Design a binder for this molecule. Structure first.
Ligand SMILES: *[C@@H]1O[C@H](CO)[C@@H](O)[C@H](O)[C@H]1NC(C)=O
Ligand SMILES: *[C@@H]1O[C@H](CO)[C@@H](O)[C@H](O)[C@H]1NC(C)=O
Ligand SMILES: *[C@@H]1O[C@H](CO)[C@@H](O)[C@H](O)[C@H]1NC(C)=O
Ligand SMILES: *[C@@H]1O[C@H](CO)[C@@H](O)[C@H](O)[C@H]1NC(C)=O
Ligand SMILES: *[C@@H]1O[C@H](CO)[C@@H](O)[C@H](O)[C@H]1NC(C)=O
Ligand SMILES: *[C@@H]1O[C@H](CO)[C@@H](O)[C@H](O)[C@H]1NC(C)=O
Ligand SMILES: *[C@@H]1O[C@H](CO)[C@@H](O)[C@H](O)[C@H]1NC(C)=O
Ligand SMILES: [Zn+2]
Lengths: 100, 294, 246
């Protein structure tokens, strides 16, 4: 599926700069009850593009397991979650994808 | 040879005006729909039900009609109309339907198996959501047995899932059945508060008194027209009448038990009816041996 | 309270249907109060409604206030209340648990009814009641409760005057409840009071009604009353000429 209008409205994908003070470590937040956001000071770079792919992989995982109960609303083990991020990150950087 | 008859040119329908309109702006736009566990049961009767305003209200997330066709909503008439207003979450909308089982369906409100009506739902995140949280709305998630169709339960007894009496207090294996929705603007679609008003139509052994509004056409006078005046149908020429009716009388009949005057439903005016001209046609002919002129 | 009796005379005729007839003798089969029939005068707690009822009140003080209708007169079965105060008439169709002896204080209606658990119907209209005889005809036919009424100035006389006053339909209601018994509610001040009302019971009958130029029922003939009336109904004329008629 594709991203929520709430995700687009609430998520801060661009560095506010100036007066605003914030942490720039990328993170995908599954706040709960259908709220998903990305906290990323994203600039126009290839590494930032791939990191955005990784974070949206996180959010797709979170959306997928949303139906299950709260205690089970996690990855099957500690590795699958970043694994699902990293497979998308690897596929994004392929020259075929770049040319497409 | 034959008969000559003047066909009607136009069809005219005159019905009493619709000054009576059903309180649709009361069941909707109530600014407070209570909760699904205690649903508002409002009786709509003795009024003309116009769904034009219902369509003119906010766009509906779910407008599904089971018993009454959406096209024939205005056409069909019912004795009494019941509207149930409550606020439920996005995913709980599907449970309000015939044959669907879920927490809300079984423990809060059950649409009957043979329900006739339309389920009307629309988003209410603007009004029913607050940054602090709309804890006022509640729903029930613990109960002894499933609810029968169209039932209301408001009494809070501590659920005794355990083997020991709860004694009316909370604790181990003793939970209050009522639980609170929390509504915030940032919630995603599917958990946002949705306002649902369920229209229930029932037929009873009584006059319906609830018929959709019926259109009226401009009166045509001194012309052969089809006419339907407040349920009295016919073909004729409508002219001004010197006759004066009594207030309660609406029609007029002659010695031959045929309608001769009708009172116009909208403006009180006595219109005399003359049958449209008819007569035999005869062909005067000299012998066809002599000539073909007739 | 005081079951006396009187003669009805030619009273209780009403317009059967909402049609206009000019200078026409029309024969109609309907529920009518038969001519020269004995009518109970009140000066069994619930008088049987039967097919219909005819109620008459002649008091100048207008002390009579409304009526009550029901099948069993309890919370079990639906019931009907009509209360007429100075401003407007109120008709409430509710499952009314009534007092055994209903009456009103009139600025309060508390004395009348004990409870109203569910209300099926409501209606508000201009007041019915206004040397004045007020006659009412009540009947529930094919699910519609119909009330006809007439207000006639009467000269001071002991009984119902000998004349024709056709009762004009006032209210048709789609109540649709079965009505077996009725009762008359009286206004008492919490003071002794006395009121007198006439009750008659309608019957299936055939009547011959005369409509004048302006559509009013000037006269009526009850076919089954007497042989001359039967002859008039057969010939459909008030004036009958010399001869022998089958
Ligand atoms: C994206 O999501 C919207 C609903 O939010 C949906 O209508 C649309 O089809 C989806 N896909 C595309 C390609 O926009
Ligand atoms: C941060 O939050 C404060 C309230 O604590 C608010 O006044 C301010 O506008 C917000 N933004 C910035 C950039 O400080
Ligand atoms: C995927 O499909 C789109 C359809 O327009 C096409 O343009 C694109 O080249 C395709 N990508 C690959 C990698 O085949
Ligand atoms: C229809 O509307 C007119 C005013 O435009 C009103 O005078 C008339 O009484 C209405 N019809 C009825 C049956 O009341
Ligand atoms: C008559 O009864 C109606 C019932 O709604 C009430 O509103 C009105 O005040 C009453 N008037 C008097 C004079 O009792
Ligand atoms: C309406 O009246 C009927 C009378 O039989 C009763 O059974 C029913 O409970 C009433 N409705 C409500 C909501 O109390
Ligand atoms: C009908 O006309 C006559 C006069 O021709 C008049 O006396 C009578 O009162 C009229 N009808 C009514 C109901 O006024
Ligand atoms: Zn990651």
């Amino acid at each position: 599926p594709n991203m929520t209008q709430g995700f687009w409205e609430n998520s801060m994908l661009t560095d506010p700069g100036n007066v605003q003070k914030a942490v720039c470590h990328p993170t995908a937040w599954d706040l709960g009850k259908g709220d998903f956001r990305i906290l990323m000071c994203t600039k126009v770079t290839m590494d930032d593009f791939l990191t955005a792919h990784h974070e949206m992989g996180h959010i797709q995982y979170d959306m997928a397991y949303a139906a299950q109960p709260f205690l089970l609303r996690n990855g099957a083990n500690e590795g699958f979650h970043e694994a699902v991020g990293e497979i998308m990150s690897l596929s994004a950087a392929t020259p075929k994808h770049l040319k497409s | 040879t034959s008969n000559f008859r003047v066909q009607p040119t136009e069809s005219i329908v005159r019905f009493p005006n619709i000054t009576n309109l059903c309180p649709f702006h009361e069941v909707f736009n109530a600014t407070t729909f209570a909760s699904v566990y205690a649903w508002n049961r409002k009786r709509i009767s003795n009024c003309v039900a116009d769904y034009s305003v219902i369509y003119n209200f906010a766009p509906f997330f779910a407008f599904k009609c089971y018993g009454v066709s959406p096209t024939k909503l205005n056409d069909l008439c019912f004795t009494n109309v019941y509207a149930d207003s409550f606020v439920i979450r996005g995913n709980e909308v599907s449970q309000i339907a015939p044959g669907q089982t879920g927490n809300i369906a079984d423990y809060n409100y059950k649409l009957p198996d043979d329900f006739t009506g339309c389920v009307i739902a629309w988003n209410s995140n603007k009004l029913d959501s607050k940054p602090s949280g709309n804890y006022n709305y509640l729903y029930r998630l613990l109960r002894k047995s499933k609810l029968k169709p169209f039932e209301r339960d408001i009494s809070t007894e501590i659920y005794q899932a355990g083997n020991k009496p709860c004694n009316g207090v909370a604790g181990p294996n003793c939970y209050s059945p009522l639980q609170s929705y929390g509504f915030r603007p940032t919630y995603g679609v599917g958990h946002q508060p949705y306002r649902v008003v369920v229209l229930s139509f029932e037929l009873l052994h009584a006059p319906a008194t609830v018929c959709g509004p019926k259109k009226s056409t401009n009166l045509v006078k001194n012309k052969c027209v089809n006419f339907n005046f407040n349920g009295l149908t016919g073909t004729g020429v409508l002219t001004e009448s010197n006759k004066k009716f009594l207030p309660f009388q609406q029609f007029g009949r002659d010695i031959a038990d045929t309608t001769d005057a009708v009172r116009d439903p909208q403006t009180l005016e006595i219109l005399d009816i003359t049958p449209c001209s008819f007569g035999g046609v005869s062909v005067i002919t000299p012998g066809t041996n002599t000539s073909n002129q007739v | 309270r005081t079951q006396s009796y009187t003669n009805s005379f030619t009273r209780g005729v009403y317009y059967p249907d909402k049609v206009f007839r000019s200078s026409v003798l029309h024969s109609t089969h309907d529920l009518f109060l038969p001519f020269f029939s004995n009518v109970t005068w009140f000066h069994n707690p619930a008088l049987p409604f039967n097919d219909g009822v005819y109620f008459a009140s002649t008091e100048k003080s207008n002390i009579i206030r409304g009526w009550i209708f029901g099948t069993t007169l309890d919370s079990k079965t639906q019931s009907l209340l009509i209360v007429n105060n100075a401003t407007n008439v109120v008709i409430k169709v509710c499952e009314f648990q009534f007092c055994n002896d209903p009456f009103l204080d009139v600025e309060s209606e508390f004395r009348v009814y004990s409870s109203a658990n569910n209300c099926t119907f409501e209606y508000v209209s201009q007041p019915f009641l206004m040397k004045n005889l007020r006659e009412f005809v009540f009947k529930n036919i094919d699910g519609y409760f119909k009330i006809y009424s007439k207000h006639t100035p009467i000269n001071l006389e002991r009984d119902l005057p000998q004349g024709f006053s056709a009762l004009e339909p006032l209210v048709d209601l789609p109540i649709g409840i079965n009505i077996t018994r009725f009762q008359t509610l009286l206004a008492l001040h919490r003071t002794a009071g006395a009121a007198a009302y006439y009750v008659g019971y309608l019957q299936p009958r055939t009547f011959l009604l005369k409509y004048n130029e302006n559509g009013t029922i000037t006269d009526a003939v009850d076919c089954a009353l007497d042989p001359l009336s039967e002859t008039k109904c057969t010939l459909k004329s008030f004036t009958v000429e010399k001869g022998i008629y089958q």
